Amino acid sequence: AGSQLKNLKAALKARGYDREEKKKAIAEIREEFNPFEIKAARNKRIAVGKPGISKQIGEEQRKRAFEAR
């Protein structure tokens, strides 16, 4: 259907000297319009994983383990 760019311009016109509203709105549209850092399966009768976050915690864990050794 309609473009991610068209939906992004619509989301910016939706969200619109306060600061925290802009911090919240920017973080919301970033984690919404970034679909390649979640993983979605297809329900045979859906966000099923967070690959980059799981990767960075799994490698920071063994990084501090390696520095400890």
Partner 1 sequence: YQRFEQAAAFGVIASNANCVWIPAPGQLITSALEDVNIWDIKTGDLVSKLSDGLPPGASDARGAKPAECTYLEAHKDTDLLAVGYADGVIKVWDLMSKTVLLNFNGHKAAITLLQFDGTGTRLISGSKDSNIIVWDLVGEVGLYKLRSHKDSITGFWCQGEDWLISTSKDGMIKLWDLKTHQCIETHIAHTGECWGLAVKDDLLITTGTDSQVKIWKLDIENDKMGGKLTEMGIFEKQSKQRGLKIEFITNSSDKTSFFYIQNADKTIETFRIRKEEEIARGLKKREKRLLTEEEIAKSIYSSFILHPFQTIRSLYKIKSASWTTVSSSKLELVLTTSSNTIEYYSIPYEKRDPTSPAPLKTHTIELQGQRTDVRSIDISDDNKLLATASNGSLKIWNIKTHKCIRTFECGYALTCKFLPGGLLVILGTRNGELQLFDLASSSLLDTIEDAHDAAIWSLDLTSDGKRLVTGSADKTVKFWDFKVLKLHHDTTLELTDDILCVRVSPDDRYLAISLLDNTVKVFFLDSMKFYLSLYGHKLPVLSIDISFDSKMIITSSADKNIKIWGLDFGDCHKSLFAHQDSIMNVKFLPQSHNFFSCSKDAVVKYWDGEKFECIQKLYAHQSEVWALAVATDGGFVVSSSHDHSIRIWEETSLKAGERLMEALDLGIAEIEGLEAYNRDMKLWQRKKLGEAPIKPQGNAVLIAVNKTPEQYIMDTLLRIRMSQLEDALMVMPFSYVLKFLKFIDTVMQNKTLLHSHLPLICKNLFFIIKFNHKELVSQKNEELKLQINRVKTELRSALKSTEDDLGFNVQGLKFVKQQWNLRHNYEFVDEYDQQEKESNSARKRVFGTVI
Q: State the binding string over 17-36 for partner 1 (x if CB under 8 A, else -).
A: xxxx----------------
φ, ψ for residue 18, nearest 5 deg: -80, 150
Q: Least separation, in Å, of the C-beta of 26 and partner 1? A: 16
Cα–Cα dist 57/48, whole Å: 17
Q: Least separation, in Å, of the C-beta of 30 and partner 1? A: 21
Residue 16 sits in the site that holds partner 1 (CB under 8 A): no
Give the closest residue to 50 by CA, choosing from 27, 34, 67: 34
CB 48 within 8 A of CB 41: yes
Residues engaged in binding partner 1 (CB under 8 A) = 17-20
